[PDB]
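Researcher: Predict the fold of Rubredoxin.
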Amino acid sequence: MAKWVCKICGYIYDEDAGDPDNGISPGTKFEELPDDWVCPICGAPKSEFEKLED
Ligand SMILES: [Fe+3]
Ligand code: NA
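Model: Structure tokens for Rubredoxin follow.
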């Protein structure tokens, strides 16, 4: 699945990993993260992530 970078801090939202400590099961696509999910490292909103693909 896809990976996304937090443009602020460099955290990778890896769809295969999810974010279980913050309520997101492995395999959750970035689009399906709740609108108010934030980077678990720096707190940036979803808008600040960039999909790692051409
Ligand atoms: Fe971040
Ligand atoms: Na959405």
